[PDB]
Amino acid sequence: GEIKALAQEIKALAKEIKALAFEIKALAQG
Amino acid sequence: GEIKALAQEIKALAKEIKALAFEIKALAQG
Amino acid sequence: GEIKALAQEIKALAKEIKALAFEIKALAQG
Amino acid sequence: GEIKALAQEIKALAKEIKALAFEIKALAQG
Amino acid sequence: GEIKALAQEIKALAKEIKALAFEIKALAQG
Amino acid sequence: GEIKALAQEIKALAKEIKALAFEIKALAQ
């Protein structure tokens, strides 16, 4: 399914954005 | 849903960007 | 709805990125 | 509609990211 | 469809965001 | 339509993020 695949990719994008935010915090606090 | 979760991670990313900006400011004023 | 809310979070992120850029230029200056 | 509006905010974010990339390059260039 | 193509571009964006997060970590580690 | 137009802007964003990652690498290196 194409719409089902869209839901999966949005969720995976959110996860990569969270991990980016962590690396930015670690840089800031280092 | 998925879109709301994504927006929430973007908001949290923006916050860590703001705090990185402050550390960069503080370093410069040092 | 949620698509507009996401656009608004992306607009706020863009604001914090612009402010980060300003502090990096200010660091570079001094 | 809201999907076009989102696309426009994404374009504006990309522009800020390009400007940030430049300020990082300018900081690197001794 | 256009939706499948959207899902693919979102996946590719997540991939770049992951790679940016690594570069930021490598910077931090310096 | 607007979905394709969104997909394009997301592609163009991915490109600017890849360019940002390169400048960060160069600054580290």
What is the SS3 assignment for F1-29?
CHHHHHHHHHHHHHHHHHHHHHHHHHHHC
Residues in chain B: 30
Nearest-angstrom CA–CA distance, F18 and B20: 20
Indicate the number of domains in chain F. Answer: 1
State the amino acid at position F21 in one-letter form: A
Nearest-angstrom CA–CA distance, E10 and A8: 10
Q: How far is CA E2 from the centre of its chain?
A: 20
Could you tell me which residues come within 8 angstroms of residue E18 by beta carbon, excluding any fewer than 6 positions away?
A: A16, A19, A20
Nearest CB neighbour to F23, from listed D10, D11, D25: D25
Approach to solving: X-ray
Q: Which helix (H) or strand (E) holds C6?
A: helix C2-29
CB contact under 8 A, B10 and C9: yes
Instruction: Give whole-number Cα distances, E3 to A7, C15, D19, E12, in Å.
Output: 11, 29, 30, 14
Q: Which of A18, F13, A21, C4 is nearest to B4 (CA)?
A: C4
| Touching chains, E (3+ CB pairs < 8 A) | A, F
Nearest CB neighbour to B16, from listed A7, A15, A25: A25
CB contact under 8 A, A16 and E18: yes
Instruction: Give whole-number Cα distances, C6 to A8, A14, C3, C9, D19, in Å.
Output: 17, 12, 5, 5, 22
How many beta carbons lie within 10 A of that of residue B19, not counting itself? 14
Q: What token pair was written down for C3?
A: 């698509």
Contact by Cβ (8 Å): E17, F17: yes
Torsion over CA: C20, C24, C25, C30 (sign): positive
Q: What is the 3-state secondary structure (H, E, C) of A1-30?
A: CHHHHHHHHHHHHHHHHHHHHHHHHHHHHC
Nearest-angstrom CA–CA distance, F2 and A17: 24
Domain carrying residue A30: 1-30
Resolution of the experimental model in angstroms, please?
1.7
